[PDB]
Symmetry: C3
Subunit: 325 residues, 3 copies
């Protein structure tokens, strides 16, 4: 809490006056981003409260990734569709191993029996294998030479069935109230206003300090949007059952996969530019690996001191690879 | 039963006179195919009875996919080796998720505890991972630039060890009798005679209504040959233990993988044209995904109302992708 | 024991005088290699004794693959970096399925309940998925067009974190003594002296009897270095719990993945030539398959008469594919 208050209150004016100064561009992005972490850290706490207060699963789904959903909206109008696609990548990579890895590792003070074996396999994996592997992989391979008109039609079908299933499944499946109200202005508008700045910022930082443009989306942009907002997980270690921690990471990721991207892909239509679900091989091999890692660890659990270390390593390895490109 | 009687009795004369009329080609294929569904629906019931009556596992293996084995024989003489390879693809895709997906979904009236956990993992997965991943994937990657003479030699080795293992493993591992007799004439000859028509038909439908040639093999042709014959599975929901239903789908698929294709690959030798086990990337990524899906779901079970919905979605997604190519 | 004594005592003088004769080259490699099998069979027994006598896990890690580590050192100075990379491949392929496959199959006299279910999943798979899939796959995809300077930097990072984790994890995690002493001279010097011969030998056998150069590394070279040394596993069937047998195969392989290669990659720096972790697609698809196979079988166990047969088949299939290239 303490640190986060400082960053919201210091970040917004600096970001505002920074937008008024207009230069230098490189330092301000740096400032722009920093605020949003904290802004998403609140965004996350505000949703968690509302979800605790059936259909609140929509709020957890939409507004729980609203900073992901939002930074990617205006990147879509000014799209820059590439950044959108790189950022969706980063969302899955971010929860795994990063949020999950940080959770497992930090709360590796003392090992906690063996849980939750009967739950995870049945629900988490299937869609997770199903969602990612179907959703993203199929588009990539099939779209090689189709070409364009076919690409988006496939995406539309996939996207539409993903939501139509997600809604079909979901719908059939501390200190609250004040936070549920204050979120929108403190975040959803400030985040949306700082957003407008971010895209214009990127080309310039990409030309001045590279590389690369894709890296920005994949590591930095995701760190801010998804990780920070979902960082709730790490905190709930030992003090409460890490049951919820794996739920938060994978449930959120599933939602990215089955909801964020598909809706966002839909959105791409109403503006002239169109994003089909096309990923780079380095992006896709990275995603399926994380499913495999998650799956490997998820078998018995509950967690180990280096259950997280293994994960964090894998993620930081992928980050440095993504930077080198 | 009721519907199937209508389609056999109406389909065969139409198909015969259609073969006599010789035109238009497009409509008749359409008619040709329709009959065979029903013809394979009987083909399947006739084998199931015989299997119920040790070595009856050969009958279940051979004649249980005889319509797959058969439509692909004359496509091999007139091969058109491509269609053969696309159809083998469709067989695995068809059982998964389609037959398995339809079974799981339809019998999702009320959930049935958690089964069969100790059986499935040990037997179904290993060969399934082993069979598909080894059988098909290895050929594809290794065959990139070998070239030709090497391709088939690898296939021969793989094919031969697959049978030699399958026979080695298998051999060491209602209303009957009348159906066991009537099958051959009612089906194996009629199916074989309608077959002769099918191949000649495809180029024309492929040139008039496309696309594509591969699609025909992958979705339509498989629907008819394998799915229909194996559709037994869907029916046995709730009324009987779905134990057999997962057995039918995966056992059949394993047999395709370890038997149908390998024998069929062997056959390719005695005619001049030769098919090595070469698949397109879109075909192969689709197959391994289905193993992964099957594996994901297979962990605990027993099944969910949307255990099937997830599957059916994935399959229909792959079908529309395969059509777009 | 009996056979191995004959091969050490006959192999070394022949190899020495062979090195003095200098011709013909093809037959001597053949002789060179044969000795080393036996030399590594001792190398293995000498380490197993020392390990039985905390930090002895380093000896098991280093000297347990010292013939792999060593044949690849001088191939690195004279590198020929390709052979190094093909040989690391062969190490994982060798343990799986070959050592593991031979163990499972040979001790398939009578099936031994269902073990060891709770152990294997938690530890063996995660790193195994993590180690191989991260370690090797990531480098391959990401390194496509980086190019060179980036390649090795990624490798360095990966390599360094792999050891830094492996040491971090490991360190936190019959007839002895005389063998622990005699090993070095009988093997580590003789093996090192026969090594000097091996590399110079390969081009010539590769030009006279091909193919291919990669094959040499992938099948032959690995058979000798890793399999022979680790062949301890096969022997401990029934007489003792096959607990250790799966431990030997996978623990060794994990060590290859997390230690052998990374250290060896490091070594590549001090000489002018540099090996980044770059694999061919046929090499990599082969490795991940073996993880998948291992994983598939590892689910319940304990083993079946043809649990090994399935494996041995897959391996021999990969060997013939690797030869055809």
């Amino acid at each position: 809490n303490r640190i986060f208050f400082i960053l919201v209150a210091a970040g917004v004016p600096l970001s505002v006056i920074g937008s008024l100064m207009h230069w230098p561009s490189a330092v301000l992005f740096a400032v722009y981003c920093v605020t949003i972490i904290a802004l998403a850290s609140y965004m996350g706490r505000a949703t968690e409260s509302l979800s605790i207060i059936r259909i609140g699963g929509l709020l957890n789904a939409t507004f729980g990734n609203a900073v992901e959903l939002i930074i990617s909206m205006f990147a879509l109008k000014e799209g820059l569709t590439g950044i959108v696609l790189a950022s969706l990548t980063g969302s899955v990579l971010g929860n795994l191993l990063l949020v999950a890895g940080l959770s497992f590792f930090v709360g590796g003070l003392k090992y906690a029996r063996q849980e939750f074996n009967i739950h995870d396999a049945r629900h988490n994996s299937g869609l997770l294998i199903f969602a990612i592997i179907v959703a993203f992989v199929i588009p990539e391979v099939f779209s090689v030479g189709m070409g364009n008109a076919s690409k988006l039609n496939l995406s539309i079908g996939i996207s539409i069935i993903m939501i139509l299933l997600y809604v079909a499944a979901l719908y059939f499946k501390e200190w609250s109230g004040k936070v549920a109200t204050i979120v929108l202005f403190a975040a959803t508008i400030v985040v949306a206003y700082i957003s407008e700045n971010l895209v214009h910022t990127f080309h310039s930082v990409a030309e001045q300090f590279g590389w690369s443009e894709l890296f920005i989306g994949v590591i930095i942009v995701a760190i801010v949007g998804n990780a920070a907002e979902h960082a709730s997980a790490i905190i709930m270690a030992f003090k409460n059952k890490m049951d919820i921690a794996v739920e938060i990471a994978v449930g959120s990721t599933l939602q990215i996969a089955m909801f964020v991207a598909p809706v966002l892909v839909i959105c791409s239509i109403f503006f002239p530019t169109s994003m089909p679900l096309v990923f780079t091989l380095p992006e896709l091999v990275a995603m399926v690996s994380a499913v495999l890692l998650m799956i490997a660890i998820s078998n018995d659990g509950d967690s180990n001191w280096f259950e997280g270390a293994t994960l964090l390593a894998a993620y930081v390895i992928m980050a440095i690879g993504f930077f080198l490109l």
